[PDB]
Paper text:
To gain structural insights into a putative complex formed by FtsH and YidC, we performed single-particle cryogenic electron microscopy on detergent-solubilized membrane samples, from which FtsH and YidC were purified using Ni–NTA affinity and size-exclusion chromatography. Although SDS–PAGE analysis indicated high purity of these proteins, cryo-EM data sets unexpectedly yielded high-resolution structures of ArnA and AcrB at 4.0 and 2.9 Å resolution, respectively. ArnA is a bifunctional enzyme involved in lipid A modification and polymyxin resistance, while AcrB is a multidrug efflux transporter of the AcrAB–TolC system. ArnA and AcrB, known Ni–NTA purification contaminants, were also consistently detected by mass spectrometry in Strep-Tactin affinity-purified samples, validating their presence independently of affinity-tag selection.
ArnA is a bifunctional enzyme that catalyzes the biosynthesis of 4-amino-4-deoxy-l-arabinose (l-Ara4N), a nucleotide-activated sugar that is incorporated into lipid A to reduce its net negative charge and thereby enhance resistance to cationic antimicrobial peptides such as polymyxins. In terms of domain organization, ArnA is a bifunctional cytoplasmic enzyme composed of two catalytic domains: an N-terminal transformylase domain, which catalyzes the formylation of UDP-4-amino-4-deoxy-l-arabinose (UDP-Ara4N), and a C-terminal dehydrogenase domain, which catalyzes the nicotinamide adenine dinucleotide, oxidized form (NAD+)-dependent decarboxylation of UDP-glucuronic acid. These domains are connected by a flexible linker and act sequentially in the Ara4N biosynthesis pathway. For ArnA, 123 593 particles were processed through heterogeneous and non-uniform refinement, initially using C1 symmetry and later D3 symmetry. The final atomic model comprised 12 chains and 3726 residues, reflecting the hexameric organization of ArnA. Additional variations were observed in other surface-exposed loops, suggesting local flexibility or alternative domain orientations that may be influenced by differences in sample conditions or oligomeric assembly. A previous study has shown that ArnA can adopt multiple oligomeric forms, including hexamers and tetramers, and undergoes conformational changes upon substrate binding. Although ArnA was not detectable by Coomassie-stained SDS–PAGE, single-particle cryo-EM analysis yielded a 4.0 Å resolution reconstruction, which currently constitutes the highest resolution cryo-EM structure of this protein available in both the EMDB and PDB.
Numbering used by the authors:
A (entry chain H), C (entry chain J), E (entry chain L), F (entry chain I): 316 to 603, 616 to 657
B (entry chain E), D (entry chain F): 1 to 34, 41 to 249, 253 to 300
The structure:
């Protein structure tokens, strides 16, 4: 129908718009300060870009909320530099006006799909991993850069409150380290950038010797974008109205692999890339949240949705893409 | 022979002490508005009034200089330009001490400019002023060498003792009367631009020796030679050079060496961010560098 | 100097005012919506009441902050059921209005002594309780009790941030289980009334049978207001300038008593109670967290304070007080 | 031989230099998070690891002290508290140097009240720590003198020199083993603190000698002995006492003399507000004082 | 009708109120933060005090402006140290709020009686000081205390603009160096007295030698509160409407005296007054803008006013007052 | 770096922008209601226009100040008739709004380049115009029509205050009658159009006889536009960090020239213009501040700058170009 995505300029935002363009009854008006990541889409008639900044314009975003039918918050800072420089500014800004959005949305009775952050677990050591009944662990209070992260969890609670006093339909949804083509840079203020995988890309492009940090036995999992985006399509269509008030998670337990094997297939995909002649050779190995298991019971009970695509070939293709599209701007 | 001196900082205080050893009386000191020895203490113990006006380009202060009637002006590392408003009061003129090989590279911040070439021959020059500043005859030139192990504070100290022992026999020279000085060689004058922040950033293409002398020159209590990788800052307080490698690659870990345009560099004293000073092992432990 | 007490009408407020009238350099202009409990001290020459409510007045509070020299908030919701009846109101009152007053004091550089709550530790599993190095625990989302407590803890965090980036002079202090004369009523929204001692007030005065709740082994620590207010004097005068940017705890660790001994010595002090023949006898016994020790090293280091009054004295004379002040009309 | 020292400030720096002069090695230097030669630079020249945590009251630092196993523990003018929960881990004990004569003359703020009387006999004590803080037995104590003409900087220089020659004798005592202690009086023990800035205000009713010690205690670079007349601030840096009318009026302007409770006080140097320091007559001229 | 005199707690405010209570068709509502100086008139039936501050309170002043019928701005900050430490404070209070009240007065067709300053002449070289025909000389720009002062002059200019196009009913009046009983406190930063006479009272009380500035030849003019205030009354009813667009000075040019005869008169009254025995004596004279004569043509032109009360007798009553009313309990 | 110049559409603004277009690290955002004068350079990739008006948009300008790095105001009204018809409009526009902008820039620590006017010195009798030390002479009191102009000088004083307590990095600069191509029309609200040159244009195009004002011997000075803008370039890069908080003037005092000699040299350069045939001849002579000297000590103390191009060449090519670009739509 009518879709507003606040924070249109993003990685996941770009893929979400790209997949919305397949469906024929959707008008997309995307507002954000820049459009570089979506520069291909500008010419497409049904998408309309809006230069703006949620920190400043107040009635104007509300005018968007009026004109549309569904509103998608997507803004968050995942850049470490604001944590170290002045975490209080990002804490006051990227937190409070979000509640302004929630209050305006509940006043206008608008449909809200908010992306919760994966940082609320921290380092839970309890055997029985839970999301609504287990406890959360935080480190020493002496540091301020985690003040903001924990408050994000509080924000979720606030949305929950809005349920029992007016009955606003709310969806707390949580992507986990989605990757694919069109990655982002280090300093990009976009969520979805797993520092582990990005650091691996840096180790590859720099061509430094593969640093086996404690042997590389740490395990990771990865997800595909499009399967999640189609899940969000089924939420948007609201099959059975079964997504209301339920926290939905999207993750693949089975692709539970250590860093070592990841590196083996990583080199097995890199050493077949033709453009290696612009690249340093394989420098050789040199020795120097343990597990997140996603419960997909809610996903089945709300959508009957399952994942289909495997990881390995997609990671190889994304690596080959990011090696072919190395910035020509020397 | 009462005079009004304009002095500031420790060369200024040193000039005061040298002049006192000569027996000259200071009617008042026109010092500029302010760990170094403050002139106020000595002026109080020896009983000399000291005036620190915000500006002297007024009728009333020049009336004061006219009534005191100084016979000489001295300049100790002055910063501002001396326009004729000050040149006119002096019967005998004005004389400046400058720590450079004039007429080369004149102007503000000559310290880095003289250490750019790292000469083993540099010193202190007295000279007279005329309507064009720094164009009068050279009174005296004094030489000293810099050892490869010299640190900025020890150079400053050596300049101070050199100034003392120089003034010791320059003051009798003007006491006995006028001397036929030596004129400037105008055929050795050039002009350049400004300085950029990149001089602080430790870039890796210039050879080791030049940036080494800069680093050993910008040691404490100067800000120091600081550079960033990723989003992490460090500063190199001192280093040594160890002897055909790819620039940008990490050579070793224990000890750790850095590849540069010529040779290899080794960090021995330095500190990351605002932390304590420590050899590069702990810095590379936080950063994560291996050979 | 001039002292402003936000919510001076209460247990702590009344005791603080009463002891502050012992000194000769204090002017107290106390603002709150009610003044019944301070009817005795309202006539004192330098004590003047101000009918107010921070939820409505904005320039009024900032006026009082400017004109005064020290500002002390003292309001907090001690009502558990209010956490559930209308949680939105408590969220809108307890969080951002107080954030506003902290920001206002920031703009004015006023010495702020903030009354943090004892719930900062919560249910930490570590035996050696710390204040700035141990872990913190939050509850399940479906249980609403934490929506207040945890958020409160977060506000404390915010004040601390204003320390290093704004240069705010802050004094986080936490009251632990105080008692004394003029006990709080059932519905008073002022802290200073332990659930245990209040429950015993119901058991005795209501004449309920004594519940032998699982033997009565759990143990609590109690404090006298006098020691605390003496401490607040030495912080207001700021002896040695050593309390700047420090977290201080006020408690009595050594005298820790279980429920059974509490009830036993309560019955002992009750059997000597003079007005007994106007109050019905006991109806017979009826048969039916576990550890909290404070670390008061910083208080000793920065103030050199020790506790004086020992519990049973306060307990029996306060029980005698609130037994003899039963309305004699009926 | 090797131990982990906890030090801070120039006292700690001098202690490090002292034990280095005898060949002692330091496993780690646990100082607080921070013109003089930094001990960090020296320790980097010796290539020895350094750590500066905000607190040692964790099991982790407990196991650092456990498997480093130091052999003797010192305390040079430490600021942060080391309570008995850490004193238990010390195998041989802890020895803290403090600048007062134990066990007599304790109270509040000893440093200034030994300046009030200007005692020719003061002392510095190296003492043990026990379950009762600052109540351990005396290990050694040394005597020092105060000169009538001492300023803060020079007497601090004297105390540093005193620490030097004292440690010169304490080092053989500790390397030889345990040294017999001298008992104290338990009925004369306290816990010391600090003072307040408001003591700088000059109560002119105080005696001339007392005002002399007040002026002495706030010498450069301490904030200074400040007083206000009307809306005008000033601070006095140095003065003398000299041997009419009602006490409270100013007798003479050049030099400026102030009547006090007994005798007269003659102000050498003072600064008026934010202006530079200058002698008394000009100050009385600007302040409008009268004879 | 209704009279609002903003800045009631002061010398001129108190005497203005005293004069106004001599006539029967005025109601006095005085607004200010303090009431110590006018506490004699609280009990008077038609006196009504209201706490206020133009810096913070906004609704109270506007509500009074609505309700009253004549409005008198009278308070000004004259703290010297505030001029040097924080000029921004005096700029942000003393300028914009007053411009706000002027603009409200325009919007509500209200009388404005603004107290312009007499210090605008400065160092005019002409022997006869004029206001609109002689030249003016000002001091150097480097001194900070004129920074505020000069803006006041510009402020006057603004109301002058209101004269031409819209014709606001305005009157700028300048008091010149007034005196009268009920002297201001020593440390009070309130205008209303000459500095020469005040320093002379200090020279008497502290018994310091009087410093003869160039022999005390500087001539000043002095006025009495009664004559000027009755003149103010007859400007308040604005007889004949002719005072519109008129600028009125108040002064006694004939009563022009150097410091020397002030010293002679001071000694004459001091050596005679009997209660001297609780005070220190005088210590003798120590040897060490100069002439101001303003025009009073407009006062005759519009109102035909001529002053009555002289100079010496008023000093006698004022000095006798400030000698006899010193609290013996000091 | 990022530069935001308020009032991009103008003589000085256009020139400075086109000068900046030779340095590659500048992004230019130019806000104004009009864009006719910038009709060529708008297509330049890094310059972007913004329809705005500081009177109405408030958050919009402040958002620009945030996203940019340096802010340069350049708007001012130089229309004498508007000083009389509606002085209030200019009073609250050229003073109030920009004062708010200065407050904003201080609040968020932004470097400010403020354009002052040379008319503040007036008629100082010293041979060297001093800004903080010279005396002042003013015009008649009875004329308020120019009160706005001196108001601007007061604004400069405010910036002065900003020095002593905040340490704001302000750079006050004053044009002294620059000249160059793309001059402004009669009704254009852009400063720089000296009455001498403009009067010369009108007396030629209208063909009126030359008015020898007192014989045409009154002196004037001129400056090159290039010298001014390269000066501003060196302050923008702030060579040596010595220009912060400094007052810099740009002028050519050696160009002392009377109206008569301007007439003769400009004619001697203009009668060589080939296309004069559509322009009326000259009609003869009819017979009909005064001495201003700038200070260039600070210029050599900071930048060491000195002007090159010889003036009459500038004036005649500009006159030729405005003669050949006569608008055909008239």
């Amino acid at each position: 129908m009518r879709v507003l995505i606040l924070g249109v300029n993003g990685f996941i935002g770009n893929h979400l718009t790209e997949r919305l363009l397949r469906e024929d009854h959707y008008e997309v008006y995307g507002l954000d300060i820049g459009s570089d990541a979506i520069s291909r889409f500008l010419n497409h008639p049904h998408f309309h870009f809006v230069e703006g900044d949620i920190s400043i314009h107040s009635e104007w975003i509300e005018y968007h909320v009026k004109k549309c039918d569904v509103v998608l918050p997507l803004v968050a800072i995942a850049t470490p530099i604001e944590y170290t420089r002045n975490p209080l500014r990002v804490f006051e800004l990227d937190f409070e006006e979000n509640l302004r959005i929630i209050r305006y949305c509940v006043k206008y009775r608008k449909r809200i799909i908010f992306p919760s952050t994966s940082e609320v677990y921290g380092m839970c050591s309890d055997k029985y991993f839970d999301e609504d009944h287990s406890n959360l662990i935080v480190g020493p209070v002496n540091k301020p850069r985690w003040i903001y992260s924990v408050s994000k969890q509080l924000l979720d609670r606030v949305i929950w409150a809005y349920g029992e006093k007016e009955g606003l339909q709310f969806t707390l949804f949580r992507p986990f380290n989605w990757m694919g083509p069109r990655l982002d840079n280090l300093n990009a203020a976009r969520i979805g950038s797993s520092r582990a995988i990005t650091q691996l890309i840096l180790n590859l492009v720099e061509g430094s010797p593969i640093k086996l940090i404690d042997g590389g036995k740490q395990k990771r999992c990865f997800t595909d974008i499009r399967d999640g985006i189609e899940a969000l399509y089924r939420i948007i269509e609201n099959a059975g109205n079964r997504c209301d008030g339920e926290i939905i998670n999207i993750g693949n337990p089975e692709n539970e692999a250590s860093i070592e094997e990841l590196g083996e297939m990583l080199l097995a995909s890199f050493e077949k890339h033709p453009l290696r002649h612009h690249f340093p050779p394989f420098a050789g190995f040199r020795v120097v949240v343990e597990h997140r298991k996603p419960s997909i019971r809610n996903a089945h009970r709300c959508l009957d949705w399952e994942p289909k695509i495997d990881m390995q070939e997609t990671i190889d293709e994304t690596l080959d893409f990011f090696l072919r599209t190395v910035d020509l701007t020397d | 022979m009462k005079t009004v001196v304009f002095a500031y900082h420790d060369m200024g205080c040193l000039g005061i002490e040298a002049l006192l050893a000569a027996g000259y009386e200071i009617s008042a000191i026109f010092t500029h508005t302010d760990f170094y020895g403050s002139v106020a203490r000595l002026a109080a113990e020896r009983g000399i009034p000291v005036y620190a006006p915000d500006n002297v380009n007024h009728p009333l202060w020049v009336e004061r200089i006219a009534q005191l009637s100084p016979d000489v002006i001295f300049s100790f590392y002055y910063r501002h330009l001396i326009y004729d408003e000050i040149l006119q009061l002096a019967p005998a003129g004005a004389f400046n001490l400058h720590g450079s090989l004039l007429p080369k590279y004149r102007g503000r911040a000559p310290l880095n400019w003289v250490l750019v070439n790292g000469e083993t021959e540099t010193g202190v020059t007295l000279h007279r002023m005329v309507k064009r500043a720094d164009a009068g005859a050279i009174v005296a030139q004094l030489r000293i060498a810099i050892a490869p192990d010299d640190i900025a504070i020890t150079l400053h100290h050596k300049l101070c003792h050199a100034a003392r022992q120089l003034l010791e026999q320059t003051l009798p020279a003007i006491k006995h009367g006028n001397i036929l000085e030596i004129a400037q060689r105008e055929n050795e004058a050039t002009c350049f631009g400004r300085r950029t922040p990149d001089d602080s950033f430790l870039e890796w293409h210039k050879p080791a020796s030049v940036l080494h002398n800069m680093v050993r020159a910008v040691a404490d209590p100067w800000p120091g030679a600081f550079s960033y990788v990723g989003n992490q800052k460090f500063t190199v307080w001192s280093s040594r050079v160890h002897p055909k490698a790819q620039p940008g690659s990490v050579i070793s870990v224990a000890p750790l060496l850095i590849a540069c345009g010529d040779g290899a560099l080794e960090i021995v004293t330095g500190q990351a961010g605002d932390g304590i000073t420590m050899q590069g092992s702990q810095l590379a432990q936080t950063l994560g560098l291996v050979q």
